[PDB]
Design a protein around this nucleic acid. Structure first.
Ligand code: OGA
Ligand code: FE2
Ligand code: ZN
Ligand code: ZN
Ligand code: ZN
Length: 407
DNA sequence: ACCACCGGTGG
DNA sequence: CACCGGTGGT
């Protein structure tokens, strides 16, 4: 209840002040002090974008040291003094899965998806004018998104598998059952590993996604009781333009596991290239977690908060909209950088890291790669989610069979 | 409003 | 190659 600004929700969760969040996260993660970093971010509502307008970052929150284990972005709600005055927006576990696992997933998923992977077009693959080339213009190499598990379907108002006699949640090109089983095993195993981390760090969101686990098990991933996830998307060097995951269930979240190219697996030192995760409607604070101006200035000079970097680069523009050859034009971010209130708070997720955010409510995006290449990607993101209305047994078979019966 | 959306099956 | 039809967002 409230009687006292951006989307309001508390399932990640929330408290009367920044200090309360620290207690909450210290309790959840188990460690105290340095291990947990909290950045205050400010919702401006003014979207950061290039002149074209594709995703851009204005600030990059980077892991400060090996000591930093948990990053939490918090939004202090303008004018509130209640028990949910400050809410958690993003949680990032730098050391999310074992590094040997992360190395092995990188290789295996890249190899499997490049040869047997089947494309999944998405509106967020393109800018508003549907004329950009953020993915790269080589069909064999361009960044791409692949969708697996279950997903919601307007045609059934439920799982897309409502008619499927034994559906293939991990359909690869053509036929090969053995390749699909191998891909299934990796992502099933990873789903299984990630659930307890999700329970631990975002229990309220985890609990919501678990409610109907026993009613619709056919629409859940994972091999062990506690199955919050329904679908997985693999994004290889994919530039996701600013969007919200509107199909996701209410009061849940998305877990994003990041895998990086081999030149970007050591703490510190720059790889080139690098893909960023962006909240285009936020700016960073004047002040650090505990309210010190000097402290936040130190982070800026040390690079824990990297202040970008207005650019003027050259890029491709398609002569005709994709609509569901090209010319060079130069892209600019001068205007987003002129306005202190135009947002673009980004994080640089590491190899093996796990990012938690309410992707349904928060506008978000990933930056385009300099030279996208899905066959040897700079970044692979593994995005775990549950869509709305995935609460019926057997992929909603009964419902549709019954709805068509009355006709 | 109203355009435009992380597919599948039978034929 | 053609039916099935929910709903946020500028
Ligand atoms: O790649 C991640 O950081 C973000 N992924 C998405 O926003 C998505 O595919 O819906
Ligand atoms: Fe998304
Ligand atoms: Zn673009
Ligand atoms: Zn309040
Ligand atoms: Zn299903």
């Amino acid at each position: 209840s409230c009687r006292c600004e951006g989307p309001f929700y508390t399932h990640l969760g929330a408290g009367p002040n920044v200090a309360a969040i620290r207690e909450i996260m210290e309790e959840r993660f188990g460690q105290k002090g340095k291990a947990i970093r909290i950045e205050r971010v400010i919702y401006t509502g003014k979207e950061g974008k290039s002149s074209q307008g594709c995703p851009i970052a204005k600030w990059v929150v980077r892991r400060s040291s090996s000591e930093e284990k948990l990053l939490c972005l918090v939004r202090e709600r303008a004018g509130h003094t209640c028990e949910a005055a400050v809410i958690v927006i993003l949680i990032l576990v730098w050391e999310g899965i074992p590094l040997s696992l992360a190395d092995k997933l990188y290789s295996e998923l890249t190899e499997t998806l490049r040869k047997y992977g089947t494309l999944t077009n998405r509106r967020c693959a393109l800018n508003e004018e549907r004329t950009c080339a953020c993915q790269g213009l080589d069909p064999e190499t361009c960044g791409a998104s692949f969708s697996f598990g279950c997903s919601w379907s307007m045609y059934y108002n439920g799982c897309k598998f409502a008619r499927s006699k034994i559906p293939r949640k991990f359909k690869l090109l053509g036929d090969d059952p053995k390749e699909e089983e191998k891909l299934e095993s990796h992502l099933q195993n990873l789903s299984t590993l990630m659930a307890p981390t999700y329970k631990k760090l975002a229990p309220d969101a985890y609990n919501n996604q678990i409610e109907y686990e026993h009613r619709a098990p056919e629409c859940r991933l994972g091999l062990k009781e506690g199955r919050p996830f329904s679908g997985v998307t693999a994004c290889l060097d994919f530039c996701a333009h600013a969007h919200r995951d509107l199909h996701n269930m209410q009061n849940g979240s998305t877990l994003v596991c990041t895998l990086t190219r081999e030149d970007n697996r050591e703490f510190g030192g720059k790889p080139e290239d690098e893909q960023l995760h962006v909240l285009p409607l936020y700016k960073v604070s004047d002040v650090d977690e505990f309210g010190s101006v000097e402290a936040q200035e130190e982070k800026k000079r040390s690079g824990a908060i990297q202040v970008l970097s207005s650019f003027r680069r050259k890029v491709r523009m398609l002569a005709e909209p994709v609509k569901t050859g090209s010319d060079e034009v130069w892209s600019d971010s001068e205007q987003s950088f002129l306005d202190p209130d135009i947002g673009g708070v980004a994080v640089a997720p590491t190899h093996g890291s796990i990012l938690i955010e309410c992707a349904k409510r928060e506008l978000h995006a990933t930056t385009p790669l300099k030279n996208p290449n899905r066959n040897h990607p700079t970044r692979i993101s593994l995005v775990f989610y549950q869509h709305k209305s995935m609460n019926e047994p057997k992929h909603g078979l009964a419902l549709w069979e019954a709805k068509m019966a009355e006709k």
